[PDB]
């Protein structure tokens, strides 16, 4: 089990969208992970060892217990049977209580496809008769993180104390952000802007197709 | 302070909209209230005398720390200075951490006016220089409960353990029972919304702002 | 011709979404049907004979003239050429004046795919040069019924006198609802809740991408 | 009773928005009317004398059973008790089964106010205890017709056979002809919306509630 | 005429919302102004004397051709005839080709009222028969600037070269600095929205109508 | 480079959606083009020469510098690797500053698929490591034109002086509009209706997922 798993199209994308929240969950004692669907080979600069080192350093900064990769083709993500079944099999193994996956609305077709894959795989992982190994597992909560298209957030997660971890894990991708340095500062401004609506220094936006079960007097 | 106050246009409306959530807050040990803006004269198909007993019975069922009325005219709620100022004064007196007010979209213009009134009053209550008595107070959270029009909820509050209190408090208005099929339908709303999220009953609310949520937190 | 055809991803799903309206159309003398795209084999419990018997009993309760199945793979519905063409061929044969198909917004990828299949097949069935047998046929009205995601209905159909048929045809799937019993009572509450907005005991919601041609003084 | 009443802010507005539908209702044998809330003084680029003839000509073309005016101030429509109460009184006098009122979203604040007025008046007219004369009456259906702002229609009414009456009734306002290109554009609206649904012309309306529709019924 | 006028509920609000765009207009040689509807008495945590200097400093930074105030009551903005008519009169005096006004959706009821006021006043100012002095004037474009509530922008104005003027003009309100983190957040808004469109900073606006755009034109 | 390229599912569809704007851009001295994804063979009447002649005449009327076809199957458009890569390769060759592609919301599945293809191809064309020939090229602006589903336009383009060219290029498809004559007059009424909201005789609606960079005082 993971308390929280982020499914990302390639390495750096889970960090970009969810780093603050992942760092917070770790601080609160949760076991966290990122599953990357591809190795980002159509956008990566650097040797296998160099890209691997950035992932290890980002994972360290955020305090992930789990980091894995499905090795699907970069630029070839698609909601097709083979990818659906392999993600669903990973979900039964990982048993995540909460999953974050990319929001469908995006300029990058891999994000849209990851989004659809997570939906279909969550459903499949839960089916008694799905052609998969192991016990059926039903993800309790699936939320989506925005990428490069505007969105109307369903909720935000306060991450004020975790902003420097968010930023350091993204900047760990030195071959990528040294989206670039301007991309990073834009996503930091997103967090500052959204958080200020709710009276906090920084917050990370998420979308849910369902209204959340919220306790209106609970702490931020 | 109250931990939670429901502002309602006429008695029975706060219960109708938020009774399950009010009962849950009370069970969790919070201080709760309903402030009614009118006495509901233009609809009270009971006497003023018996209506008084209904309100007390409903308040007891929900375990309200506070029940009050501002005495504005039924059918005449409006976002005008007089009403804004008396509501802002009450908010300063009650110091509610969270307020629920009716959703603007409705067939009943009092609901719509109560909505606007709550917004404007929350604002005025927090202004140092406002023409009001006491210290300025800033309501932390303002959320809206749907009435008789469709809505897209921002969040739901799980109330499965409190559905019977919600229903008993509404039914406390014996003289009222828009209502017998009305109550049925509002219980069906709670069953319907709650099932999306895998719970027996839940009450829907709307926020103009995304809520600050902790996605691994308990329901 | 059918006056009304419901296209469903698997048996029980057309009943769950449209049973009241189907029972009403029958009462009004229309010839009705359900076309199931798959046999529901990845979710079914029971022998071939047992599942077949539930379908026959549900069909009886609703008074369907037509019941058929395309035998596509359960969990494998997709808007791909082979499925598109086979549904389109069924539509030319059936000649439905009105078709109901699942709404795209759903946790179950088969519903979303059925939705897209119905759209594409309606278009194909209408084409002179489509590689299909028989006379081109243009479905006059295509509406969508909600599944398990929230929706904003375009219209409702009053079904107060048909609620017990709706419920009995769903409960005919004894291996399934004995979604479960709680699922059924939730969909019954949907109907009660939606109907009460419009002053009726029960009503079934539908979505149309087009505004409907409505007569504002006509009877409910 | 009327079967159908259009509430309009100034004369020509009801025709502009709903003339095809009014003519169809009449052809199907229904009793129809327009109630104008103002005389349109602040825009009447004709005389009050000639405007009277235009209104009568337009009413005749559409076959209205009832034409009236409430005499509220042009440019001063507002959802205030005085106006609410006089409109609610007229609704009780006319007992319309279906009312059409302007859509709220508009550049002209009278349209917006007429919208709110209709909502509040429908409500008041149905209240036993309202300060009004006669029996309480509950309008069955309230729908809204778009003005000069974009809208997402809830439904369309097929008016292909009635397009010429719609156009003749609008053109009846000779002194008016915002308008010559205005009329052209509103006829193009009807052509455009109607084509989505495979008909020559249709008039769009908005409902806050999904309509009770019979999906195999005739257009 | 002005080429561009920003109508703001209290001083600092026009700058907060539209300062980058105002500075750009000025750099391109347009005539610009801010008309404040109130003096912001109910919030001015400086003196009236020092507030006067702040407004002048902010106006100078942005290069405004016109700065004025209508003296309406802070916290009492309302879409009522008195206020409508005085605003419509000012629009006739200023003849602005483009007006910016606050977006309706807000926690502060003055923003909401200023929005409605601008709509109604634009309309009245253009009416031959309106009870106003001077020639009728028709504002060509009316757009809305967001305040403290979320919004979906219709368009953005690239202001990368003007971000420092925007910030200096807001900071000119020394006595004010809702604000220090407020300013930071509004600069972050501009960074965030601007990045969607590949520019350093941009200011968002809302139009109820699609804009007339030339899709190969320069930013 | 083209200043403006319209990507259309079949010949006549770019003209129907964008003709006015294309004619305007030409008048203003821009180099314009239409890339048709298919040859419209499942909807065309007439010989290869006849259909070819209509395209040449429409292209003439609008003043296109470029007219091309990718030869994908009519009724078989899909966001699949082969179609994605071939459109992306065409975009790198053409180097369009501004591209218009069909809006996703449509009854015709080819429009929806063209829409998704343009998005994915714009992304691919811009990638250093995409398996394509030639210099990476990043389309600056991608907008969408409505087809047969309602829409909420993001902007309109004033085309009052170009309405007769728009209409003549559509009517050049004599085998098609002699959608038919009624279809044409409906799209002309769309332009008249939308333009009147903004005080112009005719305007063509477009959608953008991003707010546009607009100069609020600029000329229409």
Give the residue from F220, F216, F209 showing the smallest Cα distance to F153.
Answer: F209
Q: How far apart are CA A40 and CA A37, in angstroms?
A: 9
* Beta-carbon contacts below 8 Å between B and E: 29
DSSP classification of residue F207: B
Q: How far apart are CA D27 and CA F73, in angstroms?
A: 50
Task: Test B217 with A218 for CB contact under 8 angstroms.
Answer: yes
DSSP string of chain B, one letter each residue: -EEEEEEESSTTHHHHHHHHHHHHHHHTT--EEEEEEE--TTT--S-HHHHHHHHHHHHHHHT-SEEEEEEEPTT-----HHHHHHHHHHHHHH-EEEEEEE-S--SSHHHHHHHHHHHHHHHHHT-TTSS-SS-----SEEEEE--SS----SEEEE-GGGHHHHHHHHHT-TTT---HHHHHHHHHHHHHHHHHTTSS-EEEEB-SS-EE--TTS--
Task: Test D149 with E122 for CB contact under 8 angstroms.
Answer: no
- Up-side HSE of residue B207: CA atoms within 13 Å toward CB? 26
Q: How far apart are CA B16 and CA A19, in angstroms?
A: 41
C-alpha dist (Å) from residue E11 to A18, B92, E4, E88, E106: 39, 27, 17, 20, 17
What is the CB neighbour count within 10 angstroms for residue A178?
10
- 3-class DSSP state of A113: helix
> Is B29 exposed, middle or buried (CB count within 10 Å of its CB: 0-12, 13-18, 19+)?
exposed
Q: What is the resolution of this structure in A?
A: 2.0
Residues, chain A, total? 220
Chains that contact B by 3+ CB pairs under 8 Å? Answer: A, C, D, E
What is the CB neighbour count within 10 angstroms for residue E135?
8
Q: How far apart are CA C94 and CA C102, in angstroms?
A: 18
By Cβ distance, the residue of F4, F200, F215 closest to E157 is: F215
- Residue A169, phi then psi, degrees to nearest 5: -70, -35
Q: Do chains C and D touch (3 or more CB pairs under 8 A)?
A: yes
- Asked if the C-beta of D73 comes within 8 angstroms of chain E's C-beta atoms, the answer is no
Give the residue from C66, C75, C83 showing the smallest Cα distance to C124.
Answer: C83
Give the residue from A143, A39, A127 showing the smallest Cα distance to A89.
Answer: A127
The order of strands in the sheet holding E211-212 is E211-212, F155-158, F203-206
The residues that bridge with F8 in the sheet, in sequence order, are: F36
How far does F83 lie from chain C, in Å, by closest CA? 15
- Asked if the C-beta of F105 comes within 8 angstroms of chain C's C-beta atoms, the answer is yes
User: What would be the CATH architecture of the domain defined by F1-220?
Assistant: 3-Layer(aba) Sandwich (3.40)
- Would you say A195 and A203 are in contact if contact means Cβ atoms under 8 Å apart? yes
* Beta-carbon contacts below 8 Å between A and F: 26
Chain E environment of F98 (Cβ under 8 Å):
215-216
Dihedral sign from CA coordinates of F90, F102, E214, E158: negative
Task: Test B209 with E150 for CB contact under 8 angstroms.
Answer: yes
Chain D environment of C157 (Cβ under 8 Å):
212-215
Task: Test A190 with E192 for CB contact under 8 angstroms.
Answer: yes
**Mutating which of E105, E150, E182, E195 best tests the A interface, going by the most A Cβ atoms within 10 A?**
E195
Residues 6+ apart with CB under 8 A from A51: A11, A39, A40, A44, A175
Give the residue from A177, A108, A202 showing the smallest Cα distance to A146.
Answer: A108
C-alpha dist (Å) from residue D112 to B66, D14, E120, E124, F193: 38, 14, 10, 14, 21
How far does C111 lie from chain B, in Å, by closest CA? 16
Residues 6+ apart with CB under 8 A from E52: none
| Contact map slice: B 1-30 vs D, CB within 8 A | none
What does the angle CA B6 – CA B7 – CA B11 come to, to the nearest 5 degrees?
A: 95
- Would you say C41 and C69 are in contact if contact means Cβ atoms under 8 Å apart? no
Q: How far apart are CA B110 and CA B91, in angstroms?
A: 19
| Contact map slice: C 151-210 vs A, CB within 8 A | none
How many Å separate Cα C81 from the centre of its chain? Answer: 22
> Is C198 exposed, middle or buried (CB count within 10 Å of its CB: 0-12, 13-18, 19+)?
middle
How far does C123 lie from chain F, in Å, by closest CA? 6
Which class would CATH give D1-219?
alpha beta
DSSP string of A34-53, one letter each residue: EEEEE--TTT--S-HHHHHH
Q: How far apart are CA D155 and CA D211, in angstroms?
A: 8
C-alpha dist (Å) from residue B8 to A190, B80, B145, C196, D188: 36, 17, 10, 22, 46
Chain C environment of D204 (Cβ under 8 Å):
211
Q: How far apart are CA C123 and CA B29, in angstroms?
A: 60
Domains of chain A by residue range:
1-220
How far does B151 lie from chain C, in Å, by closest CA? 9
How far does B109 lie from chain D, in Å, by closest CA? 6
């Amino acid at each position: 089990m993971l308390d929280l798993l982020v499914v990302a199209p390639h390495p750096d994308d889970g960090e970009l969208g969810c780093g603050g929240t992942l760092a917070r969950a770790k601080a609160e004692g949760l076991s966290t992970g990122i599953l990357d669907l591809t190795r980002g080979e159509m956008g990566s600069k650097g040797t296998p060892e160099e890209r691997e080192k950035e992932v290890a350093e980002a994972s360290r900064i955020l305090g992930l217990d789990f980091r894995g990769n499905l090795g699907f083709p970069d630029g070839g993500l698609a909601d097709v049977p083979e990818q659906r079944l392999k993600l669903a099999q990973a979900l039964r193994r990982l048993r995540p209580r909460v999953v974050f996956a990319p929001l469908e609305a995006d300029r990058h077709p891999d994000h849209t496809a990851a989004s659809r894959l997570a939906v279909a795989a969550v459903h499949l992982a839960g089916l008694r008769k799905a052609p998969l190994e192991g016990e059926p597992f039903r993800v309790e909560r699936l939320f989506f993180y925005p990428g490069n298209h505007p969105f109307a957030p369903s909720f935000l997660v306060k991450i004020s104390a975790f902003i420097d971890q968010w930023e350091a894990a993204v900047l760990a991708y030195r071959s990528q952000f040294t989206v670039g340095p301007k991309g990073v500062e834009a996503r930091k401004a997103m967090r500052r802007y959204w958080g200020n609506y709710l009276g906090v220094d920084y917050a990370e936006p998420f979308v849910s197709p369902l209204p959340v079960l919220y306790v209106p007097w609970s702490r931020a």
